[PDB]
Design a protein around this ligand. Structure first.
Ligand code: RRP
Ligand code: CA
Lengths: 52, 234
């Protein structure tokens, strides 16, 4: 239970371990929030979201 | 889809439906972007000429969200083999862009390492389509979805009377009457992570449907992410 194994590393989506550390990233159409963990849609109908 | 539930309004927006000259759905697909559809290479064999319909949930009415698209380019894996269904992946480039709206949105393409270690290690994935509701049953006029648990690689290799290559993985139930079926092929297999869905498989084949001691076999999308990428740029 370390880094990306401990709750996806607190990342919203992709989690990678670089130099014994967690680095989050997002799918195309999202931008990593200022906290470096959350993924914010860049427009309407971002991928992977059920439409409302 | 055998068993499972109906996709409710806006629940399976990445679902695409390949239709033949007679406007009948014969295979599924997953919307990857405004221009690209992901499907099974073996589907490109079920019809002389076809088109892609999106936003459909009931092939018996005109909800108003449906849109038919012509295929400009068919990009099938150079190594696909009809004999073993290995490398069962194809990408379709549409002549005109898909306009996202209700019931029409793309599924996310994950990163391989994260997907195989975090997505595919999840309990279940979701499979959907307008495919048969029985092994001898007729197709569904309604789009359905089924939560299928990921199946242990070894257990599946043992269960199958046919080779399970490195480009496939299994999901479904051992005895429970729930599984994809004919007509669902090419369709999406997605995995949810924190309210966001990622494509993890392509409905490929199975021995019958929901048969006891047999699972649904899907194309391992994570093994074709670099291939999909160079394809969506050509
Ligand atoms: N010759 C082979 N290699 C072969 C190996 C396994 C099965 C079949 C024949 N076959 C081919 C596909 N159909 S189907 O169209 O009804 C499908 C059922 C099903 C069930 C689950 C999933 Cl994930 C995908 C599919 S396609 C079932 C079926 O019995 C052929
Ligand atoms: Ca309809």
């Amino acid at each position: 239970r370390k880094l990306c194994s401990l709750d996806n590393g607190d990342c919203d989506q992709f989690c990678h371990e670089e130099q014994n550390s967690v680095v989050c990233s997002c799918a195309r159409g999202y931008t990593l929030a200022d906290n470096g963990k959350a993924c914010i849609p860049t427009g309407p109908y971002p991928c992977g979201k059920q439409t409302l | 889809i055998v068993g499972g539930q109906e996709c409710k309004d806006g629940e399976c927006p990445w679902q695409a439906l390949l239709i033949n000259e007679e406007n009948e759905g014969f295979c599924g697909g997953t919307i990857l972007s405004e221009f690209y559809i992901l499907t099974a290479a073996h589907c490109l064999y079920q019809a002389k000429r076809f088109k892609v319909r999106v936003g459909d949930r009931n092939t018996e009415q005109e909800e108003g969200g449906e849109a038919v698209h012509e295929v400009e380019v068919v990009i099938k894996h150079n190594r696909f083999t009809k004999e073993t269904y290995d490398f069962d992946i194809a990408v379709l480039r549409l002549k005109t862009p898909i306009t996202f709206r209700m019931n029409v949105a793309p599924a996310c393409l994950p990163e391989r390492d994260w997907a195989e270690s975090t997505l595919m290690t999840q309990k279940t994935g979701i499979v959907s389509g307008f495919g048969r509701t029985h092994e001898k049953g007729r197709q569904s006029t309604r789009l359905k979805m089924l939560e299928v648990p990921y199946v242990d690689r070894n257990s599946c290799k043992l269960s199958s009377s046919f080779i399970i290559t490195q480009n496939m993985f299994c999901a479904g139930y051992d005895t429970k009457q729930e599984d994809a079926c004919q007509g669902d092929s090419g369709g999406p297999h997605v995995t949810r992570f924190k309210d966001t869905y990622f494509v993890t498989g392509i409905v490929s084949w199975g021995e019958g449907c929901a048969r006891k001691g047999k699972y649904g076999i899907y194309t391992k999308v994570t093994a074709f992410l670099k291939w999909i990428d160079r394809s969506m740029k050509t």
